[PDB]
Specification:
The chain has strands at about 10-15, 20-25, 25-30, 35-40, 45-50, 60, 65-75, 80-90, 95-100, 110-115, 120-125. By secondary structure, it is an all-beta fold. Strands 1-10-3-4-5-6 form a six-stranded antiparallel β-sheet, with no helix packed on it. The termini are close together. A hairpin with a 7-residue loop joins strand 5 (about 45-50) and strand 6 (about 60). The chain is built from no helices and eleven strands.
Length: about 140
């Protein structure tokens, strides 16, 4: 379990993992290891992700959160991801977005970087049942 009260929190992921990041911000600069890129800019209203959109990333407009934001990405294959994020919106309503992409990026070895979580967010990184302590350290 890697947690940083600074601003960024990195942690290598291993097959069959689960990333539960509870942060209170409108921006999240994510860097999934080195074989994937994903920038969640809720400030403008779009989540740029490079999974399998061919050639490069794909910009998909997202709701306008309002403070708290729960991002839960469960891994369970070569690159299969399940981005299930539930957060509060400016529309005074709950926003539960989901993404299911089998062919995304890596899995076994992938140091994901989460910047913008500020000092108060927790990064729950566990391989289903076991705990991947940096799975490299």
């Amino acid at each position: 379990k890697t947690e940083i009260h600074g601003d960024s929190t990195k942690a290598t992921l291993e097959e069959g993992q689960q990333l539960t990041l509870t942060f209170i911000s409108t921006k999240l600069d994510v860097a999934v290891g080195s074989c994937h890129s994903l920038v969640a800019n809720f400030l403008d209203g779009f989540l740029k992700f490079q999974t399998g959109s061919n050639s490069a990333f794909d910009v998909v407009e997202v709701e306008e959160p309002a403070g708290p934001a729960v991002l839960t990405i469960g891994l369970g294959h070569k690159g299969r991801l399940a981005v299930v994020l539930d957060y509060t919106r400016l529309n005074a309503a709950l926003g539960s977005a989901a993404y299911v992409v089998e062919d995304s990026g890596c899995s076994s070895s992938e140091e994901v970087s989460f910047q913008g979580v500020g000092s108060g967010a927790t990064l729950v990184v566990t391989t289903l049942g076991e705990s991947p302590t940096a799975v490299s350290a």
